[PDB]
């Protein structure tokens, strides 16, 4: 038998060393490995046989594995290290990962959404359907809420919103789409995309025109 | 650290993480010890009483100095057996000679040598008719001396084993006489920091022999092992009978591959001698004069055992033998036929009663392993 | 330089079958131990198989008598053929090399490759309709304002987005998708660009969605 298990959550104070544990069956003393995968990347191999870092990995990393449990330790703890971390080993002849461990480096500076709201395209209308756009960005922390208002009487019907995701910047980002009948578009004066962040609330708004481009 | 993995198909264990320390050649250093210093001797005889009685020594070994020169040398007309047993023919150069270097070796002023000359080279170290043959004692004022208690042992070492000393004594090669003599060895500064830190595992591994006695001085040869490859990736397989398939017959198999392997070159050299390989901690001291080599396509045998690729070295039988086989960390158990096997701890004697088949048990799981009435105690010690 | 590329699945209907591929540059294949590791987006990694280079092969419990892991060792490709495919199998599928250690035993995963989504679903392949998004008439924000394509109503994932051809890099933000109630993905891209350069310099959003065999360039 083998199944590894590691805690899905870890925090760290910046610059203060911290670390994560992966423990199962007998790791004693079984050959480990350690993967770092930032969102949307393939995962890359941070440490293998164990406490042994491969060519061109920062030495602020290193491992420990003895008995029940293996632990990956980060000395420097820079925010660029914020990621998912996975550990693996071998058994029978077959492999095993356990998927838990994200990191955090706190507290990052609290920063607010930069919002870009697009009114629907010509071809879009010309295609007899209109879909709005709201693009958030470069903010923190990663919880946000979207308000969709037509002529400043809200309607939350007919909107699809993402669940906010991180970015290389280590600030979050997320997007939301109002879909309409073009006639509904022109039939109203003003459209607004209102995001509520800390309760500190950023709204940008657009509306129908004749102008090129 | 040290890891082990169990292969359910071959019912065998493969333990990894040993850094091999490997002997390659031999550093031979000749110490010839002279009699002194006897220069604190009185001028006068007496049949009064203390000591000497180191005469029977200078005879007793001079006696067998001919025993080897006769019973062996003339009558001359698996590691280390042959090796030092053969390396005597280093002495057939040294002895059956005139002095060679003898006096000209050390001279003045050093007790050391740069090179021993010869048909080949060597180290030369040292310390201390009408000859001695002195007889006397006199009681005047007595102190510690006329036993430096150094030579006196050298015989009892040499004589009791008949001229061939199975290991290097403290008083055969002095701690610093051996330490310095390391510093001169022909590999590197890497193995030195080890061979010095490991020193005792040299002496267990050494051979020594008596070049000469005469009266002039006692000349003996210390051969030392020298390890060329210091840290290398070596690992050890342990096997037990993997039997199968009961319709009321038995189809069984066994690995013949164990137990040791190491690769320096790399080429993978395998060490089949039960001896020839010894563990101190992480490091594994093995004798390079053992062998053989096999290919690095040996590796496969671990993974699929049935590989057409490199037919593996195994054994077949319709005859299962229920037995136990111990690992560096855990132990393998094969319970077959009508027999009965189980485990246990130090605080309970029977805890689990094992299945009939191959089964692996680590040292967290048990201590005792009861086989049908032989207890194997689960070691920290290897094959 | 050593790297791997996996050859997409796209979309396969349940009760399905399909076959992936990994071909790698910079090393042999029968030389090395290799294996297949899948990840369902947002969740964790799952080893689904391994190939021991002697021809000998083991599979993870969750797929057995389904998946077969092969080699051409001519094209230097690695194959994973999937059968009787089911909803749960939907995931990215990474190929990565497994190191040989010293003796025969397997050690680590040194290099991976981006991996290519299978989506397993009973549903309609649908390529995107790309409508460009015009830069604000207001001027001049930082001297800089923001244009980009919108990739709408498309299935299944993924959708590549470039700008012009690659020579436009910086200033770019290509958003993650949104699954809709209709269960068709939608996407975006945005470039922060100088107002001073607009009307001089010209911008083409560049979209490739493979499983629909749809390549598109819209100007903007
Ligand atoms: C075998 O034979 C040898 C030699 O005959 C003996 O070796 C001698 O042993 C004695 C006893 O320890 C030594 O006596 C010592 O002599 C020193 C004087 O010589 C010094 O001369 C000058 C300066 O004057 C120095 O440059 C030089 O380095 C010498 O040191 C004394 O320093 C010694 O210490 C003290 O001795 C008495 C104390 O009661 C005082 O009178 C002194 O002032 C001094 O404090 C000591 O006396 C002698 O030197 C050794 N000689 C040699 C050649 O080695 C062995 O002892 C003997 N073995 C046995 C078992 O009997
Ligand atoms: C370790 O190594 C062994 C052997 O290399 C692997 O075990 C398998 O053992 C058999 C025999 O040794 C291997 O050879 C054969 O493969 C054939 C392939 O399948 C056929 O069936 C389909 C189904 O419709 C056809 O489409 C297909 O093209 C093939 O013709 C079998 O036909 C063979 O049947 C055997 O039947 C008897 C035994 O009952 C024998 O007497 C025959 O001579 C004949 O060989 C046989 O199975 C087989 O290739 C090996 N497996 C694999 C995947 O290659 C172990 O698999 C391997 N260890 C691991 C983990 O894989």
CATH code, domain carrying A77: 2.60.40.10
Give CA–CA dist C114/C93, Å, rounded: 8
> Can you say how many angstroms the Cα of residue A22 is from the centroid of all Cα atoms in its chain?
23
Radius of gyration of chain C (CA): 21
Q: Which residue has the tokens 């500064």?
A: B189
Pair B253, B358: CB distance under 8 Å: no
- Chain C touched by B235 (CB under 8 Å): yes
Q: How far apart are the first and last CA of chain B?
A: 18
- Which helix (H) or strand (E) segment is A183 a member of? helix A182-186
Query: Does the domain formed by C1-122 have CATH 2.60.40.10?
Result: yes
A-B Cβ pairs (cutoff 8 Å, strict) = 20
Residues A12 and A103 occupy one common structural domain: yes
Residues A126 and A102 occupy one common structural domain: no
Say whether C56 and B302 touch across the interface (CB within 8 A). Answer: no
Pair C14, C34: CB distance under 8 Å: no
Give CA–CA dist B270/A78, Å, rounded: 47
Q: Which domain holds residue A12?
A: 1-107
User: Rounded to a whole number, what is the distance in Å from the CA of C109 to chain A's nearest CA?
Assistant: 7
Pair A51, A58: CB distance under 8 Å: no
Give CA–CA dist B3/B1, Å, rounded: 7
Give CA–CA dist B166/B199, Å, rounded: 16
Pair C203, C164: CB distance under 8 Å: yes
Closest atom of ligand 2 to B307 CA is 2
Mutate to test the pocket of ligand 2, among C52, C55, C104 (most ligand atoms within 8 A of CB): C55
Measured from the Cβ of residue C138, the count of other Cβ atoms closer than 10 Å reads 8
Residues A121 and A196 occupy one common structural domain: yes
* Minimal-distance CA residue to ligand 2 atom 12: B306
Q: Where are the domains of chain B?
A: 1-383
Q: Which residue has the tokens 């493979």?
A: C210
Helix axes B151-160, B55-67, angle to 10 degrees: 30
Q: Which chain C residue has the Cα nearest residue B7?
A: C105
Give CA–CA dist B375/B89, Å, rounded: 47
Give CA–CA dist A133/A178, Å, rounded: 6
Strand runs (DSSP E) across C61-124, as ranges?
68-71, 77-85, 92-98, 109-112, 118-120
Give CA–CA dist B155/B172, Å, rounded: 10
Count of residues in chain B:
383
Q: Which chain C residue has the Cα nearest residue A205?
A: C136
> Å resolution of this model?
3.4
Q: Which CATH superfamily is domain C123-220 in?
A: Immunoglobulins (2.60.40.10)
SS3 assignment, position C52:
coil
| DSSP code at position B156 | H
Residues in chain C that come right before a backbone break, where C and next N are over 2.5 Å apart: none
CA-CA distances (angstroms) from residue B237 to A93, B278, C54, C77? 16, 14, 20, 34
Rounded to the nearest angstrom, the distance between the alpha carbon of B313 and the centre of ligand 2 is: 22
Residues A96 and A115 occupy one common structural domain: no
Q: Report the number of distinct structural domains present in chain A.
A: 2
Residues A3 and A98 occupy one common structural domain: yes
Q: Which chain A residue has the Cα nearest residue C36?
A: A95
Could you tell me which of A167, A10, A13 has the C-alpha nearest to residue A76?
Answer: A13
Could you tell me which of C53, C106, C77 has the C-alpha nearest to residue C4?
Answer: C77
Pair A93, C106: CB distance under 8 Å: yes
Strand runs (DSSP E) across chain C, as ranges?
3-7, 10-12, 16-25, 33-39, 45-51, 57-59, 68-71, 77-85, 92-98, 109-112, 118-120, 129-133, 144-152, 160-163, 172-173, 178-179, 185-186, 190-194, 204-209, 214-219
| DSSP code at position A186 | H
Q: How far apart are the first and last CA of chain A?
A: 65
Tokens for A201?
């609330």
Q: Which phi and psi angles does B24 have, rounded to 5°?
A: -115, -70
Q: What is the largest CA-CA distance in chain A?
A: 72
Pair A145, A196: CB distance under 8 Å: yes
Could you tell me which of A83, A133, A143 has the C-alpha nearest to residue A113?
Answer: A143
Query: Ligand 1 within 6 A of B145 CB?
Result: yes
Strand B123-127, strand B12-33: pairing: parallel
Tokens for B62?
């001079």
Give CA–CA dist B287/B78, Å, rounded: 10
Measured from the Cβ of residue C90, the count of other Cβ atoms closer than 10 Å reads 21
CA-CA distances (angstroms) from residue C9 to B83, B93, C128, C177? 64, 77, 18, 19
Pair A66, A28: CB distance under 8 Å: yes
Pair A172, A125: CB distance under 8 Å: no
> Can you say how many angstroms the Cα of residue C81 is from the centroid of all Cα atoms in its chain?
18
Nearest ligand by distance to the CA of C69: 2
**Percent of residues in chain A assigned helix, strand, coil, to nearest 5:** 5, 40, 50
Pair B52, B146: CB distance under 8 Å: yes
Tokens for C161?
């987005």
Burial letters B357-370, b for 16+ CB under 10 A, else e: ebbbbeeebbbbbb
Alpha-carbon dihedral sign for residues B153, B158, B159, B161? positive
CA-CA distances (angstroms) from residue C108 to A49, B76, B284, C36, C105? 8, 57, 25, 13, 10
Pair B187, B138: CB distance under 8 Å: no
Could you tell me where in chain C the CATH 2.60.40.10 domains are found? Answer: 1-122, 123-220
Beta-carbon contacts of B224 under 8 Å, excluding residues fewer than 6 positions away, are B26, B27, B28, B29, B168, B178, B181, B182, B185, B202, B206
- Partners of C144 in beta bridges: C194
SS3 assignment, position C5:
strand
Residues A116 and A85 occupy one common structural domain: no
Give CA–CA dist A42/A35, Å, rounded: 10
Beta-carbon contacts of C152 under 8 Å, excluding residues fewer than 6 positions away, are A131, C128, C129, C130, C131, C186, C187
Say whether C178 and A54 touch across the interface (CB within 8 A). Answer: no
* Minimal-distance CA residue to ligand 2 atom 61: C56
Could you tell me which of B34, B77, B29, B317 has the C-alpha nearest to residue B182?
Answer: B29
**Residue ranges of the alpha helices (H) in B70-210?**
75-76, 82-87, 91-94, 102-106, 151-160, 175-183, 190-197, 200-203
Whether a cis peptide bond, with omega within 30° of 0, leads into C140 is yes
- Which helix (H) or strand (E) segment is A181 a member of? none
| DSSP code at position B349 | S
Q: Which residue has the tokens 């008598």?
A: C65
CA-CA distances (angstroms) from residue C146 to A97, C24, C149, C198, C203? 42, 39, 11, 10, 11
Tell me which chain B residues have a C-beta less than 8 angstroms from the C-beta of A92: 8
């Amino acid at each position: 038998e083998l199944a590894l298990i590691q805690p899905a959550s870890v925090s760290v104070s910046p610059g203060q060393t911290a670390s994560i544990t992966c423990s199962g069956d007998k790791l004693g003393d079984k050959y480990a490995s350690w993967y770092q995968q930032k969102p949307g990347q393939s995962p890359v191999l941070v440490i293998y046989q164990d406490s042994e870092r491969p060519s061109g990995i920062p030495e602020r990393f290193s491992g420990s594995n003895s008995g029940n449990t293996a632990t990956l330790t980060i000395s420097g703890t820079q925010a660029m290290d914020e990621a998912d971390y996975y550990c693996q080993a071998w058994d029978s002849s077959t492999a095993v990962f356990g998927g838990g461990t994200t990191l955090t480096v706190l507290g990052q500076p609290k920063a607010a959404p930069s919002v870009t709201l697009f009114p629907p395209s010509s071809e879009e209308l010309q295609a007899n359907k209109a879909t709005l756009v709201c693009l958030i960005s470069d903010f923190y922390p990663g919880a946000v809420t979207v308000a969709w208002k037509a002529d400043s009487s809200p309607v939350k019907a007919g909107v699809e919103t993402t669940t906010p995701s991180k970015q290389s910047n280590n600030k979050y980002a997320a997007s939301s789409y109002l879909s309409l009948t073009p006639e509904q578009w022109k039939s109203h004066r003003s459209y607004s995309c209102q995001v509520t962040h800390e309760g500190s609330t950023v709204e940008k708004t657009v509306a129908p025109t004749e102008c090129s481009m | 650290g040290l890891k082990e993995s169990y292969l359910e198909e071959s019912c065998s264990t493969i333990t990894e993480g040993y850094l091999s320390v490997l002997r390659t050649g031999w550093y031979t250093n000749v110490f010839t010890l002279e009699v002194g210093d006897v220069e604190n001797l009185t001028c006068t005889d007496g049949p009064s009483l203390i000591k000497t009685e180191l005469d029977l020594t200078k005879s007793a070994l001079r006696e067998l100095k001919t025993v080897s020169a006769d019973q062996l040398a003339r009558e001359e007309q698996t590691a280390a057996a042959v090796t030092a047993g053969i390396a005597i023919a280093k002495t057939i150069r040294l002895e059956s000679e005139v002095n060679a270097i003898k006096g000209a070796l050390k001279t003045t002023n050093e007790a050391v040598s740069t090179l021993g000359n010869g048909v080949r080279v060597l180290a030369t170290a040292v310390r201390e008719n009408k000859n001695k043959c002195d007889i006397a004692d006199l009681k005047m004022a007595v102190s510690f001396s006329q036993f430096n208690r150094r030579f006196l042992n050298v015989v009892r070492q040499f004589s009791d084993n008949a001229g061939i000393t199975p290991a290097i004594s403290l008083d055969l090669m002095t701690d610093a006489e051996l330490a310095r003599a390391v510093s001169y060895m022909p590999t590197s500064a890497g193995q030195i920091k080890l061979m010095l830190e490991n020193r005792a595992m040299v002496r267990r591994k050494g051979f020594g022999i008596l070049i000469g006695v005469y009266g002039s001085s006692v000349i003996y040869m210390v051969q030392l092992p020298i390890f060329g490859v210091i840290d290398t990736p070596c690992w050890i397989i342990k096997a037990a009978p993997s039997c199968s398939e009961k319709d009321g017959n038995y189809a069984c198999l066994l690995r013949e591959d164990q137990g040791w392997y190491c690769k320096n070159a790399g080429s993978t050299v395998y060490y089949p001698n039960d001896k020839d390989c010894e563990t101190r901690g992480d490091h594994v001291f093995c004798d390079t004069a053992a062998g053989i080599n096999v290919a690095e396509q040996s590796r496969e045998c671990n993974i699929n055992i049935s590989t057409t690729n490199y037919p593996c070295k195994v054994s077949t039988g319709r005859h299962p033998i229920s037995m136990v086989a111990l690992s560096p960390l855990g132990a393998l158990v094969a319970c077959y036929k009508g027999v009965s096997c189980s485990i246990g701890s130090n605080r309970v004697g029977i805890i689990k009663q094992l299945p009939k088949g191959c089964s692996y048990i680590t040292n967290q799981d048990a201590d005792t392993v009861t086989i049908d009435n032989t207890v194997y105690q689960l070691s920290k010690v290897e094959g | 330089e050593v790297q791997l590329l996996e050859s997409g699945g796209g979309l396969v209907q349940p009760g399905g079958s399909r076959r992936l591929s990994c071909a790698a540059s910079g090393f042999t294949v029968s030389s090395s131990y290799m294996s297949w590791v899948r990840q369902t987006p947002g969740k964790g990694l799952e080893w689904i198989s391994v190939f021991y280079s002697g021809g000998t092969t083991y599979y993870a419990d969750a797929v057995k008598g389904r998946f077969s892991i092969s080699m051409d060792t001519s094209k230097n490709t690695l194959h994973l053929q999937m059968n009787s495919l089911r909803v749960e199998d939907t995931a990215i599928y990474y190929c990565a090399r497994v190191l040989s250690r010293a003796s025969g035993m397997p050690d680590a995963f040194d290099i991976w490759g981006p991996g290519t989504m299978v989506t397993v679903s009973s549903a309609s392949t649908k390529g995107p309709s790309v409508f460009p998004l015009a830069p604000s008439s207001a001027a001049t924000s930082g001297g800089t304002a923001a244009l980009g394509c919108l990739v709408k109503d498309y299935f299944p994932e993924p959708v590549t987005v470039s700008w012009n051809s690659g020579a436009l890099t910086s200033g770019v933000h290509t958003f993650p998708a949104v699954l809709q109630s209709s269960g068709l993905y939608s996407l975006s891209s945005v470039v922060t660009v100088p107002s001073s350069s607009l009307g001089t310099q010209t911008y083409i959003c560049n979209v490739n969605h493979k499983p629909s065999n749809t390549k598109v360039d819209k100007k903007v």
